[PDB]
Design an enzyme around this catalytic site. Sequence first.
Site, mmCIF file in Angstrom:
data_model
loop_
_atom_site.group_PDB
_atom_site.id
_atom_site.type_symbol
_atom_site.label_atom_id
_atom_site.label_comp_id
_atom_site.label_asym_id
_atom_site.label_seq_id
_atom_site.Cartn_x
_atom_site.Cartn_y
_atom_site.Cartn_z
ATOM 1 N N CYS A 108 23.097 53.113 49.084
ATOM 2 C CA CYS A 108 24.153 52.561 48.243
ATOM 3 C C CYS A 108 23.984 53.058 46.838
ATOM 4 O O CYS A 108 22.965 52.807 46.189
ATOM 5 C CB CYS A 108 24.178 51.008 48.227
ATOM 6 S SG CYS A 108 25.351 50.213 47.068
ATOM 7 N N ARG A 111 24.186 50.401 43.148
ATOM 8 C CA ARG A 111 23.217 49.310 43.028
ATOM 9 C C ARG A 111 22.882 48.880 41.603
ATOM 10 O O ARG A 111 22.220 47.862 41.430
ATOM 11 C CB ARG A 111 21.945 49.584 43.803
ATOM 12 C CG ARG A 111 22.074 49.564 45.308
ATOM 13 C CD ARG A 111 20.726 49.901 45.906
ATOM 14 N NE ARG A 111 20.544 51.360 46.000
ATOM 15 C CZ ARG A 111 19.411 51.951 46.341
ATOM 16 N NH1 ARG A 111 18.323 51.232 46.595
ATOM 17 N NH2 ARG A 111 19.365 53.276 46.459
ATOM 18 N N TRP A 280 33.598 47.218 45.049
ATOM 19 C CA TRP A 280 34.808 48.032 44.850
ATOM 20 C C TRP A 280 34.587 49.499 45.269
ATOM 21 O O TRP A 280 33.490 49.939 45.464
ATOM 22 C CB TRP A 280 35.276 47.976 43.391
ATOM 23 C CG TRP A 280 34.217 48.282 42.418
ATOM 24 C CD1 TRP A 280 33.788 49.544 41.990
ATOM 25 C CD2 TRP A 280 33.414 47.331 41.721
ATOM 26 N NE1 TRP A 280 32.769 49.399 41.076
ATOM 27 C CE2 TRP A 280 32.529 48.057 40.885
ATOM 28 C CE3 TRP A 280 33.355 45.924 41.715
ATOM 29 C CZ2 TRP A 280 31.600 47.416 40.037
ATOM 30 C CZ3 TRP A 280 32.423 45.282 40.871
ATOM 31 C CH2 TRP A 280 31.564 46.037 40.051
ATOM 32 N N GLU A 285 35.367 57.745 48.695
ATOM 33 C CA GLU A 285 35.408 57.112 50.021
ATOM 34 C C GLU A 285 36.811 57.227 50.668
ATOM 35 O O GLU A 285 36.940 57.529 51.875
ATOM 36 C CB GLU A 285 34.959 55.659 49.949
ATOM 37 C CG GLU A 285 33.588 55.435 49.237
ATOM 38 C CD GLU A 285 33.254 53.936 49.075
ATOM 39 O OE1 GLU A 285 33.121 53.275 50.130
ATOM 40 O OE2 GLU A 285 33.119 53.411 47.929
#
Lengths: 411, 407
Positions: A108, A111, A280, A285
């Site tokens: 991720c 973070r 969000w 993506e």
Amino acid sequence: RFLKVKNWETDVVLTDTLHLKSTLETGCTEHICMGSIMLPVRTKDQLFPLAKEFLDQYYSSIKRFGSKAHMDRLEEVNKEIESTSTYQLKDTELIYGAKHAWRNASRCVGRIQWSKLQVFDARDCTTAHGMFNYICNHVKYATNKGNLRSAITIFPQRTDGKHDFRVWNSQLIRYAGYKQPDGSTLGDPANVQFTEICIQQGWKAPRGRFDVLPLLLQANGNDPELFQIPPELVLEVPIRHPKFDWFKDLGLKWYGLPAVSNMLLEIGGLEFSACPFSGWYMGTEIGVRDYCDNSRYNILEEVAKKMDLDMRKTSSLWKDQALVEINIAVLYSFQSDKVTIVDHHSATESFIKHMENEYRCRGGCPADWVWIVPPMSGSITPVFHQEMLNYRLTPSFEYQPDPWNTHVWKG
Amino acid sequence: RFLKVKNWETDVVLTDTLHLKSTLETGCTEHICMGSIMLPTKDQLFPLAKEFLDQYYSSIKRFGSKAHMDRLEEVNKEIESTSTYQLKDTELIYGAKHAWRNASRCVGRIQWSKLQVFDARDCTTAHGMFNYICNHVKYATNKGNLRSAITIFPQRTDGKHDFRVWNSQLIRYAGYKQPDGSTLGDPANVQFTEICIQQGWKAPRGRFDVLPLLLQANGNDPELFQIPPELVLEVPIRHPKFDWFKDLGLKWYGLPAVSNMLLEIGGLEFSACPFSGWYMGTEIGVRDYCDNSRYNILEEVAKKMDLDMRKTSSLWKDQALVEINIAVLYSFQSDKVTIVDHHSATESFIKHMENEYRCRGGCPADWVWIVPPMSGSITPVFHQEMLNYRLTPSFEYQPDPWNTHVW
Ligand code: HEM
Ligand code: HEM
Ligand SMILES: Cc1cc(N)nc(C[C@@H]2CNC[C@@H]2OCCNCC(F)(F)c2ccc(F)cc2)c1
Ligand SMILES: Cc1cc(N)nc(C[C@@H]2CNC[C@@H]2OCCNCC(F)(F)c2ccc(F)cc2)c1
Ligand SMILES: C[C@H](O)[C@H](O)[C@H]1CNc2nc(N)[nH]c(=O)c2N1
Ligand SMILES: C[C@H](O)[C@H](O)[C@H]1CNc2nc(N)[nH]c(=O)c2N1
Ligand SMILES: [Zn+2]
């Protein structure tokens, strides 16, 4: 022992000592690296050590390690385990755990935000209807009219693994996929199998390109039930391009709220099999993966067709050209509507600052390079040049198999 | 122990068995993955020799035969008597081709078997090295129709008589640091460029000055040689749509030729083994041109394109990145110099992977290096799982010699 990572753009060298608290195994050995493999009922015996370990961390964090408060709680969990074979987390421990699972999520890039997480405790839930109501509240709270706020909702933990809470959807909000008799797909090809189950389960499918799936929810090990999220709760953004007026006529839109619902949260040895979380989007993506994967919406050809690109040789880089414009469009559209979104330059830069701060404060930051690097323009982001150490800390989020392969149908 | 790899776009699943013949260590443990880290006697030599000759004789369908057992004895005797041994030409060619076949970081391996090997084990001086290298350069370049080649200098002996090419590639541009404070030319080569000047090079102090070779023979102090200018094929960089592009003053060289690596065949170390093929466009356009620590020309190109540079979310870096890379490819193609784009190279490599799976039982591959530094997920390699492991014969990276030389 100490381990070093170099940034090859800046020559900054960092030292990892945190990797020494790593228990779970990577999938790698001294003879094979599985760094690009996507996927490389508990006893009393194994539970109290995992409980103890976690509570030691919690008590250190709050600077009460070794306190009477710490010892009494070890004692109290001890007893609960021997008597009931499990235990219940205090609110303060659930919150801390949920945050740390995010902090420890090596794949991720988001973070830097780990400490601002709204935890919704839904351990008092008992029915799918109850799950539905909890999930609606999550969606409305997270969406916040476009000013997105990170949140997770935690449903009751695994008991004997015959009574699992599960969210069958992989994300709370996702579009339907309809495989046609001609072999073409309508809508999102990733969601074809799940759409088929929904329909089998009684869903009446609109059958268009952007039909928001119904939630499919399993409570206490029962068969799951359908629920339509109220549409006024589902924030959507129509996709247009700042300079290309024909872009809107492609008919694209996307949902504002990315919300992962298929993961397993592990805290102090307890397993939360339904723990949908949301933050969000990073623009890539949607613009790279969702729109441009061959196995997804696959819009490169149609966009390049309309941009009149030379499409007869790959070396015209026509694919690359269309890819950038689509990603410009996604970011433009979200920003114009005041829906939170982050571009891949900003996200990776922020992540590098988070990583460095983590090395200073924590002694490490486990990171999966394969996932952290964005799927366009890799090397013009600072994470490309950053060496990372990947290792597994708990609390953690884990993939679990889709529940329709495992579920015992009660009928 | 039978490991699977999945392509997530095609659902093709492949079974790896070749990793069980893996020999060297990855630097990963079951506790930590080091996948993104750039750098993770007579007794020792004979097993290494045997393992190699065993694969060699098996490859020529002669495993366990008369000729096989005979060679194994001869090599054993030579080692026991001399403390090393010598490869037959045939073994050397096989060794070299396989080292490239085994290079898990190399996207171009579909080509592995078309490698012209130049045996330069009879070399004894730096001047001889220079001759061999000029000949390599001219053969490989081939007026733009590039041909893969390696030139192999004598093997290491006691390690005090190493052959080394001090350059990291045969052909690279100079880097100089200015009173200004900034950098002229290629900033990766500042350190090398000062050593050249220090050893006598008369630097022109330009942006694109082809560096001299520094060649070290038989463990001696290295020596400067200018490659004949007429042997270094260069490409001026223009755009097919942007008139102004040319005026950036950009050129690159046609011949990528890695010269700082170490070739290990059947336990023998060839510390000078410069090799070359041809470029994938992204290597120049993305890395050489756009790295912050390199020529770093995004900022200047974005300006000429009149893009909004006020905010990162306009994707101006990305927009400029693509056009820069369009320009690299267009120029090489217009000048008839072999080049491959990242779409074409990754497609070929998936073809290569599948041949290797069905023919060899696998193909070691380092996903972090195979996926191009632009547009990752639209190339098929992004979606392909890969297993990374170390097979021998191999190319291994070696420390820059100036760190480790007695002057
Ligand atoms: C706040 C904004 C956030 C951003 C921009 C962000 C960004 C990303 C991205 C780009 C990925 C890569 C995976 C993919 O591309 O599908 C990822 C993975 C992940 N994130 Fe974050 N994320 C955010 C928030 C969160 C939150 C709130 C949580 C949990 C509390 C979380 C937990 C994870 C986990 C567990 C993964 C691995 C997912 C998987 O294995 O499928 N993220 N994140
Ligand atoms: C013929 C066309 C070739 C292509 C298109 C190609 C492509 C590449 C690329 C894109 C890389 C990534 C490294 C980087 O980004 O700097 C690489 C690395 C590598 N290639 Fe190939 N290559 C070719 C020929 C060869 C040949 C002829 C050999 C050996 C005989 C070879 C051996 C290697 C090795 C050992 C590496 C890793 C280099 C390192 O560790 O720095 N390649 N190659
Ligand atoms: C096989 C498998 C294993 C695994 N761990 N995971 C998957 C989901 C994949 C990951 N890649 C595509 C798809 O996951 C798509 C959804 N991912 C969203 C997210 F996780 F990146 C995220 C979460 C919260 C935010 F606020 C923002 C973004 C598949
Ligand atoms: C520290 C370190 C380790 C290592 N293994 N390597 C390096 C050279 C870096 C790596 N990556 C960029 C740069 O090396 C640039 C040269 N690479 C050219 C090549 F290997 F890709 C190649 C070879 C033959 C061809 F025909 C075409 C291309 C540094
Ligand atoms: C095979 C490979 O590991 C796989 O395609 C990965 C690569 N990197 C990724 N990175 C992110 N963020 N999300 C993904 O789904 C993937 N897929
Ligand atoms: C840290 C990271 O491994 C490093 O920046 C790598 C990433 N991938 C790469 N890939 C290639 N082909 N070449 C490189 O030089 C690098 N650099
Ligand atoms: Zn690994």
